[PDB]
Symmetry: C5
Subunit: 338 residues, 5 copies
């Protein structure tokens, strides 16, 4: 994620012009290789037309250029591309919203799972750790960065999200499906035990705990589903062919023709098709942004900060349910009591 929210708090004369200077997370870094390839192909074709082709070959080439310029608009680039990008962006925000955050659970846990003693601390920390473990399991399933951090379950154990006995039980479960849901079931069982022992003092609190657990587990399931049900491959293929087919056609149709031939709208050889380069910038960059966003859990500059979220959630959950449990300042009259 490349945040710039603070820099655009106010409308100002410069606008986003200062943002145009950023490299990390920028369109330029995404697209300069493709832009250079388009420009190089165009210049090679132009040089061939200017220096290699005989006069008769030049006349036929001019006919081909006029034809391609005339009929490249038959390719409905904006239609398919607008649809595709809208779908990708909608999925992008929904996937961020499905991130397995444990803040609501930590609030319920600190409010409902009681005891200053070692056993109460163990209950609170372990419930929070099961939630964090489910998050880690699903994220190493769907995020390339998290998987690199945790290539094996042994790495999960070494980071402290899972104990060795927990690891043994996890591997002993006979199931060929992804086991990210296992710590949520452990959470439900541990909550039942806490209720049975009276650490959870009432049925309503136990119910709230199970409700928030199911909300969390559903976020993990949504991440699983977004990972499994990709944007339909047909759409990705079609949009890709649309952009590439159009610019392949433009490599010919946008050639600068010999002004002495007197073709309509061809009396100026600027030698750099700067409007065509701008059009490639916009359409191919739109597609390139969709490419970055389609899997927001990779290692693009602006992909989601999944490892950061894992670390933050573990740290904040442990703080909230262990250090801050039943640790309040004195009930005092506020400044505006009178």
């Amino acid at each position: 994620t490349v945040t710039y929210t603070a820099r655009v708090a106010k409308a100002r004369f410069g606008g986003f012009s200062k943002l145009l200077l950023l490299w990390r997370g920028s369109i330029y870094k995404l697209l300069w290789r493709e832009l250079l390839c388009f420009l190089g192909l165009f210049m090679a074709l132009s040089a061939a037309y200017r220096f290699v082709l005989t006069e008769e070959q030049k006349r036929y080439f001019e006919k081909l250029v006029l034809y391609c310029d005339r009929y490249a608009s038959l390719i409905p680039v904006s239609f398919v591309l607008g649809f595709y990008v809208t779908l990708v962006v909608h999925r992008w925000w929904n996937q961020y919203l499905s991130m397995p955050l444990t803040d609501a659970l930590m609030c319920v846990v600190v409010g409902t799972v009681h005891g200053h003693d070692e056993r109460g601390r163990l209950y609170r920390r372990t419930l929070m750790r099961y939630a964090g473990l489910s998050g880690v399991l699903i994220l190493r399933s769907v995020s390339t960065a998290v998987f690199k951090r945790f290539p094996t379950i042994d790495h999960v154990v070494e980071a402290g999200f899972m104990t060795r006995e927990e690891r043994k039980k996890f591997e002993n479960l006979n199931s060929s499906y992804n086991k990210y849901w296992v710590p949520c079931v452990w959470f439900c069982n541990l909550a039942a035990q806490a209720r049975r022992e009276g650490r959870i003092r009432d049925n309503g609190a136990f119910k709230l705990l199970l409700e928030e657990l199911n909300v969390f587990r559903s976020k993990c399931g949504m991440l699983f589903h977004y990972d499994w049900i990709s944007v339909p491959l047909v759409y990705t293929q079609v949009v890709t062919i649309a952009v590439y087919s159009y610019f392949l056609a433009c490599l010919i149709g946008r050639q600068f023709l010999d002004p002495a031939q007197g073709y309509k709208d061809h009396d100026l050889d600027l030698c750099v098709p700067i409007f065509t380069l701008l059009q490639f910038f916009f359409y191919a960059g739109w597609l390139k942004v969709a490419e970055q966003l389609i899997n927001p859990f990779g290692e693009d500059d602006d992909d989601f900060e999944t490892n950061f979220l894992i670390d933050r959630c573990f740290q904040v959950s442990m703080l909230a349910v262990d250090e801050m449990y039943d640790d309040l300042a004195m009930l005092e009259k506020d400044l505006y009591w009178d």
Copy 2:
């Protein structure tokens, strides 16, 4: 479902070009027959114009070609097609979201329905099995693949989702409507019995069980409704006529005319209307993708994996509520306890 999420985790120079090489779930496999039919019809008309028609017939045909090319744009293909595809895709994701998954129920069941003995195991497994049975019934109602797997209720019994006595009661119910809802009522009754016998220890847990049951049953009902209330037939007919009428017109309007006749924008006979073939690819392929997505529970390559989901849900539910019930590792201090 043809997943490729992992392959597009990062924006890369190639883009989706590597995805262009996929066959299963690809646009090519969906559309090559129609594309070949368009090309063959076009070439037959071109050959007739080139070899069969007399000169006067050729002049009249050229007039017709110019006319059709001029006025085919009157057909608003992008308008109707954009609307139709947007509707279909929205329905597609909502239908996936309505898949009858039992994970939330299994969490509540393992947390609230107690007893290590045979009776407690029976309660937990049977509640989960009733949920899975409702899923199977609705899916064999709406999914062609699931119906092929379970052509009769006898097949449901043989797979273990329903007992023979349960089958007898199911058939004895006098109702002409789809009975997918029956196991959800069985679930409610069994939960009431569990509460009465004390297996469900509190009213809040019983309430949570009924809430999650109703959420699940509503997902099944949504699948029923999406199956019953198709995309309006008027829309499907109109969009189909739009695409076919436009390309039927293009079969004439996009013919290559004799360059010696000197018609404007007709001084080049490439003999293959490659831009028209690309346009058919895009518009007819858009329609073909809508055709794949409109019923996502069929046997297209990228239709939903309904049998896989049935098997996964049964396996995971049974594991969670039977093997993992009240089976926790020792409460131990974590790595960062200190």
Copy 3:
């Protein structure tokens, strides 16, 4: 409702071509009268130009035709029509979702309202019947078909949804507003009585019953609101004028002009403006589909099956809460118990 979901489970070579053969619920049945009127008006004007008009009148008419063809595009048909159809379709699906279905209530009722005796059966059946009665009242308020089935409250009594004493109380209530909400209040009172007598064993179950009642009542209220707050009349008038004004203009602008006059793009008299007929088909058919969908509770072929839903809900609710109350097969080990 004209369902065809099963026929389009798989993408196939034919596509929706087989659907083009359907009459009931088809675009043809909606639009053939208007299409024939457009064609007849066009042919009358063409015949007048061809046979009645003098040469000078013909020249002036040709000028008028060129002018109308030139400037009919000033009318923004696709703009207003796209907006209008999007609004109508969104409302269409939301109205279907607001249908007063009693399945969730029947689940809660069978799970929480107890007694095999006559009194318990009366409680369960009467709660379900009050819900069904509220549905019937709102549907006869908003659906023309349901109102034809139940023109008076006496017809409601004769169908069994309301008793004679209930009818007397219903008429004795002094209120000029629609009384569809009355049986929901009766439901709340009857539930309170069931709780007081112990038929509802716990406060949580009573709360769940009231929650589901309020969900149901809100669906009925949403139907009332969609019926009362029509699509703004301004929009319907404007879109109607847009389509009609454009095709009125096309009746002149799309006339086939005498080819001997040599007007640009007018050297071919096909005598049937088939592209204009196709354009009327698409735009006027889009408007005609909006006309069908704007009130989905009428008697169009593809309007919602409101009487079917009323009958199904009553039958299924009675079955679920009376015949299937506390009527379970023996708790038995499943096939995969071991």
Copy 4:
């Protein structure tokens, strides 16, 4: 609100043509003054060109007309207008959905607040009246019609929504912010008292009451927020300038030029720019509909019926919680009992 839902239950040959005859709530009534002003300005300019201008002035004017007709399309009317109208309509439906209806509260109140005696009736009626009072306060804050009905709090007292002692307490509260939320806090306090005295028999019912109160209060808050956070002024200004600037340009660019001058596409003087009048009708009428909808709580014909809703809610709430409290017909076997 101008309802016509019943008249369009079925698709019919006439379509919406019969709706074109309506005046109240019609586009004509909204737009005839502006349309007449456009037509008058156009005719004045035409008369000046036809009768006042010298020949040389006429030639320069013809140049200006051609220029304006050529370049008025630079103004992106459909772009900004489509966006603006979409935003306004979305807000319109959301604002209707936020109307402070008390039906859900009345159901909960009649089901949970008990006693046939005077005190129980007082509790039920006063809880409902507090909800209705909050509705009245917010509506007189946001609806011009309601404010005209209740220009002062004294008018609220005289209508019976607030007692004199309640008025004294309401004015004694020291707060410069809108006090619409005050009766909701009174509601919470009165519910707490009812629970303490046993009129609310259980904690679950008290919780449900507070939940529904918070839902209602949130609807009132949403109305407050929609009133405070207008559609951004920048958008309204920009869209207004777009429509006006375009038609100001059309006043010149759409002038009928002297046919003897032989300008291309100017050989016909119809003297009434009927296509331009139609275009003003559509674009300016779209803007005019947005003007009606942007504040749906005013006194436009099709604005929401806020006074009607206030009266209906008070009448229905009082009926439901006072006359119909614990007033049920005998539990009797229904027609299909056997």
Copy 5:
């Protein structure tokens, strides 16, 4: 926020014309500097062409102008800009909806946390103050205006939202992440203590308190996430380049050419490209509105009134839970009791 909802309650002849006179929050104030820069650059280029360039240089410049006018349309300004503005506006309303308002919490607190004595008042005021403190912390994190009001936590203490002992505990917590969530955990702990001491009389009320706390905390978290996950930088850069590149091209392509040269559509030198100025107004103003809205928590005229909301919430919460706790007018018969 610049509200004008009251001024547009009714559709009127003037329309939004009176709104065109507003300066604060207007498009003019946002855009006059950029508009003046465009106009100045255009006039400098025009003066150079008119007075500095030699005849041959003038002919080449005319060729360049024709070329740029021809090909600037290749830049898809409306495509990218429409997408970008739609995304920004959606985020804008969602961010307003995530504002940390404490009204629902104050209702629950006044209804569930009891005692007229000093301790009960302390409980109610402190729970509300913790909620308000979390709001202040997140808002000083995301709003430039709030941060200016509270540059340090010491300023938070001095305003009364946090006590000195609370400040000491807040700083003693060892965490590098934003601590806005800390007072919500304090809230949960204080609620647990209130329940333990009997100030919260029942488990259901305690559950409702925790539910509303989690709703509030989630609003704060949503503000954090919208601040962190900006609109993707790629989109902002691309849209900015689109608008600037197009108008840079227009600086040349829209030059008034010498009418004696006889170029098509160039026989009129108005010397002020008023249609191009209008087009810059619309497109660049659309972008400028997106610039204002992208961070709605800054100090633009129409940014959200965050300091106002902080003050209002504190005042109203304190009033509701302290002055109005259990302070009701006598239960009296209403006007329509009979």
